[PDB]
Amino acid sequence: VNFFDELRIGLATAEDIRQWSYGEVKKPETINYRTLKPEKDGLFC
Amino acid sequence: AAPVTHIWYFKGVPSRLGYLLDLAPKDLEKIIYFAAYVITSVDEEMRHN
Amino acid sequence: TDEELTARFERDAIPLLDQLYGGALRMTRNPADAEDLLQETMVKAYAGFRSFRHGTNLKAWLYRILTNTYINSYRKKQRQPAEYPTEQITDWQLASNAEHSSTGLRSAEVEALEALPDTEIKEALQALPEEFRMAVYYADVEGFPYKEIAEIMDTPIGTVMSRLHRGRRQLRGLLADVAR
Amino acid sequence: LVDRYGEYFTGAMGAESIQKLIENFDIDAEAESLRDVIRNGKGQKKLRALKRLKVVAAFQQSGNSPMGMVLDAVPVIPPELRPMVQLDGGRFATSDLNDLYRRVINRNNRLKRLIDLGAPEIIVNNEKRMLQESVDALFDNGRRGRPVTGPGNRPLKSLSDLLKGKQGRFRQNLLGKRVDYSGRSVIVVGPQLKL
DNA sequence: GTTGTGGGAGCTGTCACGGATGC
DNA sequence: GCATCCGTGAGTCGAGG
RNA sequence: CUCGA
Numbered sequence: 001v002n003f004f005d006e007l008r009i010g011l012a013t014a015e016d017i018r019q020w021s022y023g024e025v026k027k028p029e030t031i032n033y034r035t036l037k038p039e040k041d042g043l044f045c
Numbered sequence: 046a047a048p049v050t051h052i053w054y055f056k057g058v059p060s061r062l063g064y065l066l067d068l069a070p071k072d073l074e075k076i077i078y079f080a081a082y083v084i085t086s087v088d089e090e091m092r093h094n
Numbered sequence: 095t096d097e098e099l100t101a102r103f104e105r106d107a108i109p110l111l112d113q114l115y116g117g118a119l120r121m122t123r124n125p126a127d128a129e130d131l132l133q134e135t136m137v138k139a140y141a142g143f144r145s146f147r148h149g150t151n152l153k154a155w156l157y158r159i160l161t162n163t164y165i166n167s168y169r170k171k172q173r174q175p176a177e178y179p180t181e182q183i184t185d186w187q188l189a190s191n192a193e194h195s196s197t198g199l200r201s202a203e204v205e206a207l208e209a210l211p212d213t214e215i216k217e218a219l220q221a222l223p224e225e226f227r228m229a230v231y232y233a234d235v236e237g238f239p240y241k242e243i244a245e246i247m248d249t250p251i252g253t254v255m256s257r258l259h260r261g262r263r264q265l266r267g268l269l270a271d272v273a274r
Numbered sequence: 275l276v277d278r279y280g281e282y283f284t285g286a287m288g289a290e291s292i293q294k295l296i297e298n299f300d301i302d303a304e305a306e307s308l309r310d311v312i313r314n315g316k317g318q319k320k321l322r323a324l325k326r327l328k329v330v331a332a333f334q335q336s337g338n339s340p341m342g343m344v345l346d347a348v349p350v351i352p353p354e355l356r357p358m359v360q361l362d363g364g365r366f367a368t369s370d371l372n373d374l375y376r377r378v379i380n381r382n383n384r385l386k387r388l389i390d391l392g393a394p395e396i397i398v399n400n401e402k403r404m405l406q407e408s409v410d411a412l413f414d415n416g417r418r419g420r421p422v423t424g425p426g427n428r429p430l431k432s433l434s435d436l437l438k439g440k441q442g443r444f445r446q447n448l449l450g451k452r453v454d455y456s457g458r459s460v461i462v463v464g465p466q467l468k469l
Numbered sequence: 470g471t472t473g474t475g476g477g478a479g480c481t482g483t484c485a486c487g488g489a490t491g492c
Numbered sequence: 493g494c495a496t497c498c499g500t501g502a503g504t505c506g507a508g509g
Numbered sequence: 510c511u512c513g514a
């Protein structure tokens with residue numbers, strides 16, 4: 001609604017970093033070269 | 046697999062890590078990048094005994 | 095002491111890894127890639143160090159190890175596929191990609207007009223009895239299974255499917271000249 | 275000092291070391307013992323006191339445990355903000371970010387595989403240093419050491435580069451943007467015009 | 470599975486300033 | 493006791509390829 | 510990269 005009152009910063013604890021996440025990426029693979037499809041558990045999973 | 050220092054707070058002049066632990070930035074670097082060991086804690090009672 | 099025949103590796107093999115670096119960096123053209131390659135080679139050599147003959151030259155063994163590891167790296171990089179880094183993909187690149195994508199870079203105009211009702215098909219639907227048309231909706235637009243259509247309609251399956259057939263026939267009648 | 279006396283102390287090198295030093299750290303103790311010496315005397319030592327006190331007092335009054343300064347988990351930015359495309363030619367283009375993340379993740383997996391293979395302490399120490407350096411690149415590439423370069427020796431745009439500069443996020447996309455219902459063209463004098 | 474000889478490209482014609490650092 | 497070494501600034505908006 | 514005000 002564009003009527004916030006304040007905006008605040010703070011160092012993120014690993015707890016915050018994991019609460020944010022939706023899953024951990026594990027592989028360097030990005031997309032399947034053939035099918036142009038994101039490799040699972042990759043940076044585009 | 047092993048913790049990492051947020052380079053903002055180590056290399057960011059003045060080194061926040063330095064001022065927080067009262068360590069010279071150069072020694073802090075030697076520590077962080079594996080050119081020198083640092084003493085985490087000493088068992089003073091056992092040593093005295 | 096098989097664990098001692100490994101620490102002896104820690105005495106002999108460690109010193110020459112500096113020149114091993116030098117070489118792998120002359121190979122990879124990049125410092126970070128040279129470090130990654132040196133670590134990969136050291137892992138490969140330590141894992142199967144049982145194959146290293148005692149008292150014989152160890153530098154050439156690790157050297158061939160590094161060269162073979164670099165060859166394997168390139169072989170795996172063949173099907174990368176062809177990734178290149180850029181500080182920013184350009185508007186030219188974005189539009190040129192949209193020129194071959196399933197959905198193009200759409201406009202506020204396109205969106206707002208899409209939100210509007212298609213008068214032709216809306217009129218063609220309003221003609222059919224709202225029961226057979228509700229059926230053609232639950233069956234064609236939403237794609238429900240006929241069992242779920244019978245459920246949500248509170249009617250038997252036969253009535254649902256008969257309304258489906260009749261309504262499809264009707265709307266194809268009114269929407270055949272419209273479809274084209 | 276380890277062969278003998280080893281059972282009496284604990285020591286190590288790396289970031290885990292700083293994490294421990296921060297754990298065994300009394301913030302209130304340091305803050306008040308620094309105030310005592312800041313009011314004790316005056317001079318270069320008092321300037322050191324005031325400076326080294328600003329940060330400790332911030333950490334005290336903020337409720338931000340200094341532990342944050344060391345990370346055990348890195349956050350990955352959504353893919354749409356580091357997009358990937360293919361240009362005319364089948365080749366692909368990606369954001370520098372993706373490459374820095376890929377290096378970090380590769381070195382992390384290699385560190386895991388080394389820890390499992392119980393390799394020499396020097397090898398694992400090298401892998402840990404490489405991991406720290408790669409995360410530093412991912413965050414503020416070029417800040418420490420030689421910057422990470424892609425093809426053509428171009429220093430990759432780290433995560434800090436996205437906020438800095440005339441063409442960074444703030445000055446380039448927040449303080450001014452491109453708008454619709456707009457156009458451009460060359461101007462010519464019209465004398466018959468009204469002001 | 471790797472066992473004869475082994476240091477890479479890069480600046481590299483900027484300036485003016487202020488404040489940690491480091492001997 | 494400070495002298496250096498480093499890290500930060502250094503105009504805007506437009507066109508191709 | 511070069512070019513326009």
